[PDB]
Design a protein around this ligand. Structure first.
Ligand code: NDP
Ligand code: NDP
Ligand code: NDP
Ligand code: NDP
Ligand code: CB3
Ligand code: CB3
Ligand code: CB3
Ligand code: CB3
Lengths: 266, 255, 253, 265
């Protein structure tokens, strides 16, 4: 029985990925920051379906130190991975899904806002994933060959549309670019350990409708395939496949799940 | 019971892709050019496993005219797709797998230059274009209520063409053209819900490998075909116009 | 005095590139297909400004045979490059600019064969043969008598990754041209022949979408980049593309 | 006389870029962190060649607060740009060249890692971001009637990051982020006519702190010339992208790698 660690697993795409992996037989460590209620509800559902098949761990993945000597992001990430080993004695899959997403305009309080966004946006999207991957790899390396799993797989949730930047989201876009870099670098360095590292990049998935219906419909209408945003499963299914043994030759690449959105022009 | 058309399905990756799809329940149209024996042997196996689940069609996919007025590549491609409709009344998946691959050095005749161009460009790019056109036309001509629910076109590309193989310019160009076809076809065919994606192996079933970061070996046919099968599945119904490299990290290397 | 061969040099970008190179001191071979008048007018201007600094040569770059044994595209391409050597004894720069551009819809008949040969010929196959002919001549030239700055520019397209609805063949041909750039650069490196691409977005339209200036570009705004890539200051650049699209390729629908 | 701000301008490519721009008529603000001597020697040369055509500014571009309330990286970046306006009343070109480069292996303390992250990410990505922000803020605050006619930002990226260098994850990531900054900044800053492009060297003025045969093997891998590039072979491209003849280019990268990124193992 393999174990998967999914960050930001409480709702939306994170939950779908956790459910997807759980359906495949994985025990799942559900990470969360502020959504304790949803995360615990998910753990309860999964555990009821299969005893001892889900746990939850809380952690701010922003690049800042927390209250205990202050606790660093790295430590917090190492503990995330450790929680898996302590509870199930293993960690086969890591999905870097947690991510902050808000505007950081270059054009037009301001001090803490700019410094907090950087740590938050870059922490969740890039730096935490880096430390998490490091911790994940250190545990595999420290495991005697004969006792290692046969299918280690790390999935980085990237973004199919960052090459056509979203106006006013520079830091987020930068962090995603860094995450793409982490995928390529990690794949290469971790190859000898047979740890595959790939990226999955959604375009528009379960789009939040905090706007006039016509503006919500207009956005969806842009996606060439189906003229709609995707469902959570339409993304998570791809994540699950990349984690399957049938994908054991794939590493260091990205799979876009955008219904052709990245093919469009203004 | 859906139908898949697989060009160059006689051996290696093509055969694995055909077997893969067949295992999923697809009736398979096995195209071939010169490998009649192997194609028929594959058909026999597949048919024995499941009656009327496989057929074979021969066709030179090079960009030239053949003997019947002369028959053009387009016609030959249209007849390929037609064979599916004539036999099973449908064609849900098209896998552009057939491909010539040999050197066309820029640095050191006339006949072998024009034959290579038509051959390398035909199989890798032009035939796939015509095949996609024929495929789309048949779907468009089908009344909505009678259409399939999962049309998928897979273009077998190359994960290493951005790091060209010395001396293989035409092939490399043809592959680039196939990449363009993937993006263009995906966009144009979206309204008809026909997804178009690419699968790019790096080193698969080499008849060099120590340079592959993952496993330090070329891949097996299944390691590639499984990806093709997944992209054809309904679980991949939101993926279109993209490429999936199956290279074990080879495209990440430098000299 | 170096020589530059510019295909489709009669008007628009081709003409601007030819003028740009000529301004840098290049003798220019202006290729054309149907635009004889404009090409000859340009030659006259350039020749008046500097005697024996321009010539014009006609050639269909479509992948078809033409009547003088039928003449193939390769031969026609080889003669294009040869014309330069015959007249000036050299060919330092080749700019693959000539290009057909029209719809080949997949949804709603030899016109498919004429389009294929035309769109693929001008955009990809002719460039391939031209590069081949160009490289041969350099290789056949004794080291001591070779130029010091061989440069091949392939006019590509900054927007083909975001295909233009209904232009599949053209888009494919451009993808092949991109492939030719990378392959040619690698193979021709030992001969010090640099091969790069320049990809305009919207230039000299026959708009409000272009993030930069909200307008298509002028011909000079593209050709200047072609000229720089041909200069000695760019001697370490090869196998890459420079987009000249004012940020258009950064947009979404 | 237009002004160019060049980070890490003391030596190597930074110096070449500064010299290049200076040769084009630009007054140059030479930024440096540790190389005061080299930077001041360069300022002297440029100033002798043309009075009041160069100044130096020191600043740690790592993502850490410094001693004067502690001073943040943003403030330090804002002061860098300000120094240009205070001295010459303008800032037309910004070249994000400063960059840390060392291994951060994934496979086998507290200070070295936290310090590496802030350093590698600060110089390569975050400082560039703040610098661009500050640069854009001052242009926006300038009345259209007093604005320059050729604002240009160049981000020094890396032509080989897509084929990562074993053991350099953070650096590679930071470069990826810099690439994202280029695309995002180009789009957002288009209305102000501020072009943003990248220049990515492959192997330039390769350090020879190794056995000659090893150093030669490394260069031999580059398809064109079989050698690393000179500083000018890179800087000349930066200067071209900053010229008015490149006014339609924005949001793109120009590889200066002699075909290195075309190779396989
Ligand atoms: N949905 C879409 O259209 C697209 C999504 N993506 C990518 O897919 C992934 C998932 O998408 P989606 O479901 O929309 O993501 P969400 O926006 O819904 O956020 C996912 C989770 O990330 C967690 N998170 C955010 N910041 C932090 C942080 N500072 N520390 C720890 N956890 C944090 C949150 O957990 P909690 O609630 O517990 O606080 C949140 O639930 C993301 O990485 C995203 O970048 C890419 C393109 C498009
Ligand atoms: N194998 C690898 O390491 C790599 C493969 N690829 C791509 O994957 C795909 C399959 O690879 P692989 O199995 O090795 O392919 P093969 O080289 O084994 O050839 C596949 C088939 O293509 C057919 N074919 C060749 N030329 C023509 C033509 N003129 N007209 C009609 N059919 C033709 C042949 O059919 P027949 O024998 O019946 O005549 C052949 O069996 C190809 O598209 C290839 O480009 C990409 C990268 C690497
Ligand atoms: N303009 C733009 O917005 C864009 C242009 N580009 C590329 O830049 C390059 C130049 O652009 P532009 O000036 O608009 O090009 P044009 O469309 O104006 O065509 C250039 C020339 O190509 C020649 N040509 C066309 N077909 C053939 C053929 N079958 N055989 C020989 N010559 C042929 C024509 O020569 P003649 O008139 O003598 O017959 C024509 O003058 C092209 O490669 C184009 O693809 C890319 C993106 C955008
Ligand atoms: N040279 C090459 O082969 C390649 C270079 N590049 C890129 O090109 C650019 C220039 O290359 P190169 O000349 O080799 O760069 P260098 O490695 O020589 O360093 C450039 C300068 O960056 C400054 N710097 C480093 N860290 C900081 C920091 N923490 N805060 C402030 N300044 C800092 C240093 O200034 P000081 O000495 O004053 O402390 C140094 O002089 C870099 O961005 C590099 O990433 C990309 C690929 C290859
Ligand atoms: C907002 C949002 C979420 N999204 C998707 C999106 C992307 C990344 C994410 N990342 C994370 N962590 N969480 C998310 O919820 C998330 C959501 C959108 C992105 C782009 C467009 C879009 O293309 N709109 C037009 C805007 C037109 C205009 O303003 O001129 C465009 O073409 O840019 C719409 C929605
Ligand atoms: C030959 C062959 C089969 N192959 C695989 C290959 C690729 C595409 C195909 N395409 C098709 N249609 N059929 C094939 O059988 C096929 C096989 C190889 C490809 C690359 C290297 C390689 O990387 N060589 C060296 C140097 C490459 C270079 O010249 O730059 C290296 O990098 O290690 C070796 C073998
Ligand atoms: C037509 C034409 C010429 N052109 C420019 C163009 C491009 C390549 C060429 N290539 C050649 N050889 N000759 C040309 O004259 C030429 C001209 C255009 C290209 C794109 C759009 C455009 O982006 N239109 C839509 C998007 C279309 C889509 O989404 O598919 C938009 O909304 O902006 C408009 C005009
Ligand atoms: C180191 C370094 C600096 N560099 C160049 C480089 C890149 C970015 C920089 N960035 C910054 N800021 N400063 C620099 O001095 C700098 C230097 C190199 C990069 C790649 C290889 C290389 O091709 N390595 C081969 C090794 C081959 C082998 O030994 O088997 C490889 O496969 O990766 C060598 C040197």
């Amino acid at each position: 029985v393999p174990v998967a660690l999914v960050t930001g697993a409480a709702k939306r795409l994170g939950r779908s990925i956790a459910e997807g992996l759980h359906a495949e037989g994985y025990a799942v460590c559900l990470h969360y920051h502020r959504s304790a209620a949803e995360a615990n509800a998910l753990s309860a559902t999964l555990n009821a379906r299969r005893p001892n098949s889900a746990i939850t761990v809380q952690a701010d993945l922003s690049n800042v130190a927390t209250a205990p000597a202050p606790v660093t992001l790295f430590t917090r990430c190492a503990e995330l991975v450790a929680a898996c080993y302590t509870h199930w004695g293993r960690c086969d899959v890591l999905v870097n899904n947690a991510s902050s997403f808000y505007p950081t305009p270059l054009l037009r309080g301001d001090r803490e806002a700019m410094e907090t966004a950087t740590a938050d946006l870059f922490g969740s999207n890039a730096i935490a994933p880096y430390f998490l991957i490091k911790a994940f790899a250190h545990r595999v390396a420290g495991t005697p060959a004969k006792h290692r799993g046969t299918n280690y797989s790390i999935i980085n949730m990237v973004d199919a549309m960052t090459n056509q930047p979203l106006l006013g989201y520079t830091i987020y876009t930068m962090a995603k670019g860094a995450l793409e870099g982490l995928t390529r670098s990690a794949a290469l360095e971790l190859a000898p350990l047979q740890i595959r590292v790939n990226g999955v990049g959604p375009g528009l998935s379960v789009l939040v409708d905090d706007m006039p219906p016509a503006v919500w419909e207009g956005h969806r209408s842009k996606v060439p395939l189906y003229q709609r945003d995707s469902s959570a499963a339409e993304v998570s299914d791809v994540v699950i496949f990349l984690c399957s043994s049938k994908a054991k030759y794939i590493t260091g690449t990205c799979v876009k799940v955008d219904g052709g959105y990245s093919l469009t022009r203004a």
